[PDB]
Structures are given as structure tokens and as C-alpha cells.
Amino acid sequence: MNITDIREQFPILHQQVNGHDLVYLDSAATSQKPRAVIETLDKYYNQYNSNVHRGVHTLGTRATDGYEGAREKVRKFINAKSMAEIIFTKGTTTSLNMVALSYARANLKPGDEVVITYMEHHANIIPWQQAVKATGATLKYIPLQEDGTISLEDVRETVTSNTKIVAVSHVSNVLGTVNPIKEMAKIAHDNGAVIVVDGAQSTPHMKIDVQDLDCDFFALSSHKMCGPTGVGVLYGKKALLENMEPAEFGGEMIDFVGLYESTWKELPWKFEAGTPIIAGAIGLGAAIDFLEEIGLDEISRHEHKLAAYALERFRQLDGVTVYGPEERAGLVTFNLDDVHPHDVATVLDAEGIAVRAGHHCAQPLMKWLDVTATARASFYLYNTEEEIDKLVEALQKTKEYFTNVFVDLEHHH
Amino acid sequence: MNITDIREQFPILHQQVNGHDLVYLDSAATSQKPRAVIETLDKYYNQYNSNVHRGVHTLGTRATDGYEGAREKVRKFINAKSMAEIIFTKGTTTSLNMVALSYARANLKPGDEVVITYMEHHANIIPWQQAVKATGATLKYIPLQEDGTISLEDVRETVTSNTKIVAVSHVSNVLGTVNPIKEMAKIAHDNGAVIVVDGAQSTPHMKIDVQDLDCDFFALSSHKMCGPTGVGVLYGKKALLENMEPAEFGGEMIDFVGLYESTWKELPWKFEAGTPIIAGAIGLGAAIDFLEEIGLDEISRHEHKLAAYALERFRQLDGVTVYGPEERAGLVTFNLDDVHPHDVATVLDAEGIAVRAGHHCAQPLMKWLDVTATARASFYLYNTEEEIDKLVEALQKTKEYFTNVFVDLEHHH
Ligand SMILES: Cc1ncc(COP(=O)(O)O)c(/C=N/[C@H](CS)C(=O)O)c1O
């Protein structure tokens, strides 16, 4: 795995910001794309764009074969058994809302529980809050251990015979924790519940095999895994999708439409109403080909190396707190003592470094952490240890800078 | 308006299919894109892709300014009063489903009516069938005149004081009829109902001014108007959106998230959950700049010329039926006597010509027309009368060809 040759494929990395080489450490907010994906979108619009299915003309057939070809690439990439289980959506958030509307609101009654965790992103909280309110069910939270991991004993305790859905992140976008999803799915299934996995932050960075995880649903976003914006996938086991009703209705997802009643197409098209995200899905297929050629296990190994390096170097800084466990995915969320993280991010961008500040769409977790906001640097296959050095040197300088302005200000008054 | 200079901007037009120059007459299924839009997507991914809002770093700020900049371009393009009324969605179909879920299912009771028309596309039928079933309301259809137009007297008769929603196409994707939306909105409003306008086939081809139409909601798709796939808009009057709940829930559309309850952001972001369709929406902004530079009234005038030319030349063909009115948008749906339209489309694609065959997502209309399927040639700003000549010459040849094989076959047996 040669990071020079990989970085050469991403045109956006090669520019300056504020007079310094760009150091992009915000891939958990969104990833950058390689020429193979951008040129796949260009070839689509320059050569074979047309609407898909009912192919009667040559371009239509090429676009349809491109779109359904990318569906098979996704199926193989997450090792689903069938294309019927792969639905294209606009992103993880819409995929999780479809499960909450079509599966939860059909299957919850008073007394039933949906169980989630305090580290969930909003997209894997709010649809369940609304689904339990619609149905009179109960929402419950699995508690976290002090390092931000989940114990399977707390899972066993929280999940009961009244639990119908457990919904949990594969990897946290704030703590970097990799949750024990395969063992959580066994506990859910032992209690008669399904498990819904939010895979937005695991899919780009490590191999996913839905048959080994035995998850009932799994959701992911293209824009975090070198693919186009505006596209995602919902995987669900075929026997559950077959019994769920559509979340949206219109052309392409019907078989017969009468004045008052309609019948639906087979899977997966039952869940894809209207003209689909044709270019984006073909571009996500190209992103998967690109990542597979590098190797997801190679990419996870490089991120293990960068995360171990970063946590060591952050422990060299005084006055910095990092949240979450030592064993983790490729990201570090932190705060500097006495500097607001938005000001940390502002000053780092003046040195060319892009990180994110705020609650990262996880307000209940920030409350658990007893902070109002954090800064996060996150890594992917095109980042290097030299970029981590630049980050830790800039945080040192930021600390000294805010120390010096404070000392100066205090002496002034 | 110079069609040579416009066609030079669309790289896809310049190729052969089956050894003949491509003649693309399927823009009502999807439009082709000019280099200005494809290069806007390339510049986004090559230079300033990042996630949007809470901008702390330079690329994030550029992408956010691009995305919200395209929102203002849309506002001005349809003459909405505020960006709060412009919501980005994945397409017309999702925009109409959001009104059916968030407005209709909140506002219908037994005895209330939703009124639509027999020429509606499925995307403006099925969400209302489901919304009235969910609520116990009643679905009613405005009947059509014999040429496939709607009389305002039938509108007045169908719409009653129990009607809460009238939903109607601006332009039919099969008949080419341009419906009298501004006068239908007055009739709806006089009865206490809102009007929902499906503008998928009008927006690409003629100026839209939502203040003059006085529509309460209006839905459109980027891919039909020279823009990227996977993106659309829902416009709704601000006072109606402010009272509607979100259709999907997650990050970006909240203000506060507690364990069990959340509060929503202001408009329009209340309706945009999760990472948005960043590249696609910036590319739809480029498509609008491109169309505005040509002039929507110029484009409508060129399509009036092509449609008048086509209807005259089709009346030169024996054994061909065209459906719908003489005054129409830029499309012609037809059948050849005794040839199935799928075989018409197959044979035309052997001469390089792309048209569409089937029910065009309007099965109740096909039943009204007493056919099971039709062929459709549809035009846009890059098509010419020479392409119509090629179409009518090929239909003549198709007719003779099927005549000759039949005569031959009959003599054989
Ligand atoms: C664990 C996890 N779950 C769901 C989401 C929502 O994904 P999206 O915004 O692509 O719909 C995300 C996206 N998180 C944001 C922006 S992707 C971030 O971490 O900056 C996520 O990380």
C-alpha cells in the first residue's frame, strides 16, 4: 500500500489553503474522491446518460446495465446474499428513516422496546424517537463504560423479551469505538428482536460482511467512502424487506396502478420510487472497485497505524483530552483545556489544516462526555503520519498562542 | 438562439449508435447535460468538496457557500419569495411524497377529499392513494375532455368544500397538455383547499413563477432540466412548511436532541436530514444558470416550433395515432396501427433514434386512452427539425417493414 501513489489519485489534496499545503483531516465529515470516481461520473454524463429500466434504446440499456451493475458491486462488497437486499437511497440517514417508517412503525405496539445507545449519531436516534411516539412503544438506552465502549453484559441487561429492535452504530463517529455488532446481533435475536446497524463510519474503513455480522439491516453513505454525494445503501435481509411496505410511492416501484389501489414491484425496486440516483450509484460502484483494488484490510491496517501514532502524539501534549478507547478506528476527538474547539478549528485552518468542531450530530453523547462541543481530526487512506505531526505541532502552537494572549490580556487589565 | 452552438455544448450528442448518428428524442425520460454542468461537478470534486454548514475550514466554507448559493439560484429561477421555501430533495417523486406524508396525512380526516386527474403520473397518484387510505379520506378524479385537456368547469364541479388538496400536473409527460394551473389554484383556494403542482415536465421547458401561479407546493427534478441525477426541489409556501413536521429525521435538521425528544431547525433545513446532495445541488444551480443564459422563453419558443412541426409531419403518416391536444409542450406520444410500440422503439434505435415505449408511469391514463402502451418522442433545446424528419421517415419505413413482413408471412402460410 503506497500512500504517495494513492494520494496522486486525489486531485483535491494538491493545493494550498491560507498559503500552506492543505492537510485534510476531516474524512469522517466527508471523504475526498480519486480520479477513478470523478472520471466515472464524467464518462456517464459525456457518453451514456439516459433513464433506466424498460431499455429500448442503446444509451438507455448502457445506463441501466451501469446502474444495476453497481447494485451487484455493492452486494458483493458487503457480502449480501442477493441484489434484492440492496436498496439505493440518498444516504445512511434516509436508509435508517426507511427502517423506522416501514419496519418499526408497522411492528411496534405499547410495551415493545427499541433499544439504542448513548453514543448514537442523531440519524440513529431521532427516527426511533418518532417511531416509538407514533406507536406508543418505549425507547431505552444501553449505557456506556467509562472509556466509551459497550459491555455485552449491559446489552444483555438492557435488551429484554419485549425488545423488538436494537439499533447501534458499527463505529462511533466521535469515540472511534468499534462496537461488537456480531455479538449484539446474537443477543437481539435471542430476545426475538432485529438489529439495525448504522455502518456510515465503518463501511469506508474496514471490510463489511453482513452474513458474518448477521445484522438484519445495515445502512451506509457513499460520500464517506470515496463515492459521490447524495447516495447511500440500505441492506436488509430479504425476508424482512419482503414483508415491509414501501416508504415512498410513485413510478418504477409499482406493478399495477388502478384509480384507488396499486401493487408493488419485487425487491429491490419496491423501495426505489421514481428516477433513481443513476450517476451517483454508478460512481459509488467505481468507488467500491477502487477501494477493493487497494484492499479494505490494507486500509484498516494503515488507519490502525495512524490512530496508534496519533494517540501517542496527543499524549505528548499537555492540556489536551482525547475521548473514547485506546483501540479505535481512524479518528481522534479531543478538546484543548481552556480553548473552545471552534477556535481550535479556526486557527488550524489558518495553517492549512481542516478538522471539524461541534457536537458531530451526537448531542446525548456530548452530554455524557460532560462537554458542549469537541474538535475532531479523522483520517483515511490518503493521510500520513507527517500530517498528524503537523496537527500536533499546530495544537501545541495554538495552546501557546492562547496562553500568551491570555497572559498579555491579564497583565493589561 | 442558435441550435448549432447549443448542441456543441452537449458532448453526448456527438456519437453514433448502430452505425448512425445518434438522434436523442427521449428528454422527457431524462435530459442530456452541457459541459457547463459536468465541469461544475468536476470542479466541485477536484477542488472544494467538503461537508457543509458549521464551516470552520476553508474548503467546508466554499462547499457550504456553493450549496446555499445554489438554493438562492433555485429561489430566483421559480420566483419564490424566500430560500426558506426551497427544499432540496432527491427528485419530484420524493418531493410529492413529502407533501403527502407531512401535509396530507396531518390534515385529512374522514369526509375530506384529495382531488387529482386521470392524466397524472404515478408519483402524483400513489402517495395520495396511500395518504387517503391512512386517514380514511376520499380520493376523487377530475375527468378529461376528449382531446386530453381539463375543463375549468369540471374542476369546479369536482372540487368541493370538503376538498383539502387538489394535486395536478403542470404539463403532462404523455399528452403534452399544459394545464391551467393558475386558474385551478383559484378554484382550490375558493374551496378552502391547497394545490400541489407536479412541475417535473414544465420546469425544464418554460418559465415558472410560483407567485403568479399561486401554487401552494411545486415539485421538480434536476435530471429533466440539464442538471445532475438524484436531485430535485420541493417548493412550498413558507406558512404551510412552517406548520408541517419533517418527513425524515436525523442530523442537520435539529436544534436540540435529548434522549426522548428533539426540536427542529428553522426552514428550509428542517426538511433536509443528514449530509445533503451537495455536488448535485451545485450542479443543478449550474444548469439553471445555463438555461437562464439561453432564456426559458426562447427554449419554449423553440419547442413550440418543433412540436408544431412534428404534429404536422405525423399527420402526413398514414396508420399513426397521436394522443392529446394540438396546443402542447415539446413531445408527441403515439402508436402505429398494428405495430407494438416496443417494437417501434427497437427498430428506431437500430436507426440511431432513441424514443421511449410503455405506459410512461401513467397507467390510469393509458386505460383512459384505451391502449396498453404507447411510444413517445420528446424534444428539448438541443433537438432540431432535421431530427424530427429522421423520426417520421423511420416511422414510415417501420410501417412498410412490418406491412412487408406480414404480407410475406401470410403468403408463406
Ligand atoms: C456514525 C454515523 N452515522 C450516520 C451518519 C449520517 O450519515 P449521512 O449524513 O451520510 O446521512 C454519520 C455522518 N456523520 C457526520 C457527517 S457524515 C460526521 O461525523 O461528521 C455518521 O458518522
Ligand SMILES: Cc1ncc(COP(=O)(O)O)c(/C=N/[C@H](CS)C(=O)O)c1O
Ligand atoms: C409529469 C411527471 N411527473 C413526475 C415524474 C417523476 O419524476 P422523477 O422520476 O424525476 O421523480 C415524471 C417523470 N416521468 C418519466 C421519467 S422522468 C417519463 O416521463 O419518462 C414526470 O414526467
